Amino acid sequence: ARYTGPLTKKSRRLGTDLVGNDKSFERRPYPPGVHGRGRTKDSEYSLQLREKQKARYAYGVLEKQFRRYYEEADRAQGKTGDVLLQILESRLDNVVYRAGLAATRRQARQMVSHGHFLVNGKKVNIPSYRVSTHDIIDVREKSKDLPPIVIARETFETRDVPAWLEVRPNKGRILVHQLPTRDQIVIDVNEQAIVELYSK
Amino acid sequence: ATKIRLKRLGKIRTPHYRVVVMDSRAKRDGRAIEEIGQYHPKADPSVIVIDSERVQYWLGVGAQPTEAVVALLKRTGDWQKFTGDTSPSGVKPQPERPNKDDLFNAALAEADEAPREAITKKSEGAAA
Amino acid sequence: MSENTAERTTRRKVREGLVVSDKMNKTITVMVEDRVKHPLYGKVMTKSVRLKAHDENNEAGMGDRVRIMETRPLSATKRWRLVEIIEKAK
Amino acid sequence: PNIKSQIKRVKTNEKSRQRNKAVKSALRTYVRNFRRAAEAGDVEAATKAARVANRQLDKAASKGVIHKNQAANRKSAISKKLNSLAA
RNA sequence: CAUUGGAGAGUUUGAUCCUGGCUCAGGACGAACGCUGGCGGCGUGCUUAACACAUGCAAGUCGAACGGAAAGGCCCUUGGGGUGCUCGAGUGGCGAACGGGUGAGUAACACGUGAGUAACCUGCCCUUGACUUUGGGAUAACUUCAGGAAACUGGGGCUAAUACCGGAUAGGAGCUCCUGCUGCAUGGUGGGGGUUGGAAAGUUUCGGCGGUUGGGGAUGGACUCGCGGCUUAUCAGCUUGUUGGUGGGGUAGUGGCUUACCAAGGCUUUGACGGGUAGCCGGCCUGAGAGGGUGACCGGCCACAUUGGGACUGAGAUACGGCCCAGACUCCUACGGGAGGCAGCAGUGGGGAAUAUUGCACAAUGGGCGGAAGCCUGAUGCAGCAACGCCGC
RNA sequence: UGGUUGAUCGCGUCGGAAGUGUAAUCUUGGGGCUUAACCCUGAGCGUGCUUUCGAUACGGGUUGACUUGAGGAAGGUAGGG
RNA sequence: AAACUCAAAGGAAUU
Ligand SMILES: [Mg+2]
Ligand SMILES: [Mg+2]
Ligand SMILES: [Mg+2]
Ligand SMILES: [Mg+2]
Ligand SMILES: [Mg+2]
Ligand SMILES: [Mg+2]
Ligand SMILES: [Mg+2]
Ligand SMILES: [Mg+2]
Ligand SMILES: [Mg+2]
Ligand SMILES: [Mg+2]
Ligand SMILES: [Mg+2]
Ligand SMILES: [Mg+2]
Ligand SMILES: [Mg+2]
Ligand SMILES: [Mg+2]
Ligand SMILES: [Mg+2]
Ligand SMILES: [Mg+2]
Ligand SMILES: [Mg+2]
Ligand SMILES: [Mg+2]
Ligand SMILES: [Mg+2]
Ligand SMILES: [Mg+2]
Ligand SMILES: [Mg+2]
Ligand SMILES: [Mg+2]
Ligand SMILES: [Mg+2]
Ligand SMILES: [Mg+2]
Ligand SMILES: [Mg+2]
Ligand SMILES: [Mg+2]
Ligand SMILES: [Mg+2]
Ligand SMILES: [Mg+2]
Ligand SMILES: [Mg+2]
DSSP states (O other), rough: OOOOOOHHHHHHTTSSOOSSSSGGGGGGSSSSSSSSSSSOOOHHHHHHHHHHHHHHHHEEEEHHHHHHHHHHHHHHSSOOHHHHHHHHBBHHHHHHHHHHSSSSHHHHHHHHTTTTTTOOOOOOOOOOOOOOTOOOEEESTTTTTOOHHHHHHTTTTTTTOOTEEEOGGGOEEEEEEEOTTTTTOOSSOHHHHHHHHHOO | OOEEEEEEEEETTTTEEEEEEEESSSSSSOOOEEEEEEEEESSSSOEEEEHHHHHHHHHHHHHOOHHHHHHHHHHTTTHHSSSSOOOOOOOOOOOOOOOHHHHHHHHHHOOOOHHHHHHHHOOOOOOO | OOOOOOSOOOOOEEEEEEEEEEEEEEEEEEEEEEEEEEETTTEEEEEEEEEEOOOTTTOOOOOEEEEEEEEEEEESSOEEEEEEEOOOOO | SSSHHHHHHHHHHHHHOOOOOHHHHHHHHHHHHHHHHHHTTOOOHHHHHHHHHHHHHHHHHHHTSSHHHHHHHHHHOOOOHHHHHHO
16 A cells, blocks of 8 residues: 555656656656667557656555545635645645655655654644644654654755745744645646546 | 433444434434434533523423433533522533644744754754 | 414315216316426426315306315215306306 | 233233123123114113113223223214104 | 536448447446455445244333242241341233334335325323212132143132222213304304213332323324326226215224115226336435436335234234234144244354354443332444455555 | 417416425535544535415416408319319 | 347448
């Protein structure tokens, strides 16, 4: 119920950097496997499916839960892709990643599932915990000196925190100013393509 | 006989009762003549909401309460208004009150010791 | 003088119809027509039902437009009573 | 029966059936006596029989062997017949 | 004075366009099978044989109605005190008609929806007005006798009640006569008069708890009715208590419900009658919607309880764990005769592609009885089992 | 199924009001289970029905006109009807 | 009518 295999293979297949940089993605222009350099047809399904899989492997969400997110966004009022990206960003592991306390979303999932975090006073070990507005995520007092935590404390200045979060790095406290908007989620997929895909 | 009793609802190991009016012969979780209130005992200082006018009407028309409903009416004070007896009538204590916006504004500004205990944990990694 | 809750309110059902059978004693078969939409195609249809009324004195004849009021079961099939004759077509 | 309550119940049901049957048969005999007096056309005999039958109908209704509505219906029939006989 | 919602593809030809069927991508399931299988949360789990069922349990309770004393318990040289609590068996009250199950039957006022009863009944509960009077005869238990393999049955004797039966006294019960106001035809209702009548129960640890009868309330049920939801015309005639009338009977109640007499009706191509299938619905699945399919869990109504029929008792009965008769089955028998009904819970056999434990507890909620402590509750709350579903890790 | 039009009824139709459409489900707002599923709670929905009060353009009922549709009279008239 | 069977049958037109 969690993808544990290599991520560079998925990034190469999907054609975009799922996470990180300056890595084995120097072989980017071609998917993994023996048949990587051949010319591709890329149907509309192919395109749509690529966008959906890009979002899925970026956020570490499997198909059933991603589908559930899709119906929630579709029911919600407003743009379906905007709401879907808003939900995926409101996931707690992504919140930790965006605040910059984790090197990657996989590391954020690791620490969240291991329970190194407090949500507004209550301990949460659910990576899919949907953080609500005005929430206060806190690092567990016992685990305020994790090696990944201190690496993040050394590196966060380079990292860019989105406008909808406030982070007290050394304190391990992520204040949620508001639930993010499409202009605030970084554009790296085609949510419109995903929405069109979930209609066929 | 017409009874004022509790109709069980909710999950396994999580009961919420509806103080309802139905005759004795009816099954426990069935059609009720009228729904009077609710009773959540699983919650802190159990929630006890009883419609005073309706419960007074049904007591005056002759509905027989079950012992549980008698306890709830004692706590709501209805069991004293009807069948006047010297009982404490301990109207439910509230199950306290949290808040979110005030805490967020308190911490947004908290700043100071936020990043301050934060550089103290910097000294901690030093200690780490 | 001071009678109980008067009015009784509770009014009974009234139907206007056309007499289609008067050849049994103290009984007239009344045909009552109603117009309703078709459930699927929406056209306004004409639904007709035969109602047996009780006509004391046999005062109504074939083709007479009559008014009937519902009653308690007066026989195996009669449940209505004649209350007036509106047009005596004859 | 399989339940001792039900065995007790069949015994008491038989007992109550005996009691009720006796009372109903007495009621029928009294009403028949009144009917035969009425057919014979006597006035004093029919009056006495009607009084007896109505009293016994009310007594049975009180005892619960018959419903009070049934007692009232039979009494009404008897009294109407006696009135017709007198007229 | 805007919308929350609609995707196609392949395949007839040498090629084309159209028509057109077929097939596929989606969703779903009370599913099964194959491979595989870590955990948790919440659900769900005989859809077939309404097939036949071993075993345990699923409806009892009350000594503050009664005689009592077979147990335990106190007091006494082992029996004895019924003496106090207690208490088998027995009378008596209430409950057993609820809860729980199943979907065979039913194409029907069964159900959905909305009304009517001036045609209705309603134990326990609430409320209000009157009352709770005077007598009597039995009987179970017990005892004795006889019969029976048993199930049990019949005599003799004996005994108590809130058991049973006379009487008196009580309206809004019958009949009848005035009179006020009135409805929807039968009528409803207020007032007065005549006449004939209808009840009851006592008990206590003195704190209680009960009895009868009028009138209202609440609750539950009953019947009637308008409208609505299958298929079949390769089913066209159906009906004779059938349709209506009058008198009687019956019933809680209207009614051919029943009966006697009289009449000849009633229904039907707008589909009667017959055949097929089916419990109905809130809902469920699907769908842009309109619709189409469906009726598991849960909830409402109905029907049924081995098959067929019948009543009895009761406030109330398709009376699941009642009775009677018959049929088919199973069991006991000393051959004379007896006993039984898991579509209650768990379980077995069987059928099947396929569906679980012969579990724990009355702690909670609900129910029955008791003045109460309390007793009973396979309702229910839980646990076991299965990736069967959903969700999370 | 219905040409033009006067009057009237208010059945269809349309608009209010009251009653009903239990609960659960479902949609949605809040709340609780660490999240979710699930659960509680407020509202909507319950697409109808009954009662009642209005409106009268249209459909229909009742009733009266008009002649253009339709038919008839008189005259004319073609034809292997 | 049905079982059964086919993945076409067919219309107009083009070369
Ligand atoms: Mg005799
Ligand atoms: Mg009579
Ligand atoms: Mg061809
Ligand atoms: Mg080809
Ligand atoms: Mg005993
Ligand atoms: Mg049932
Ligand atoms: Mg069912
Ligand atoms: Mg008595
Ligand atoms: Mg019908
Ligand atoms: Mg008659
Ligand atoms: Mg069937
Ligand atoms: Mg259906
Ligand atoms: Mg059910
Ligand atoms: Mg009876
Ligand atoms: Mg029974
Ligand atoms: Mg039952
Ligand atoms: Mg049984
Ligand atoms: Mg079973
Ligand atoms: Mg098998
Ligand atoms: Mg209890
Ligand atoms: Mg108690
Ligand atoms: Mg028991
Ligand atoms: Mg016209
Ligand atoms: Mg006009
Ligand atoms: Mg709700
Ligand atoms: Mg929450
Ligand atoms: Mg509802
Ligand atoms: Mg007209
Ligand atoms: Mg001519």
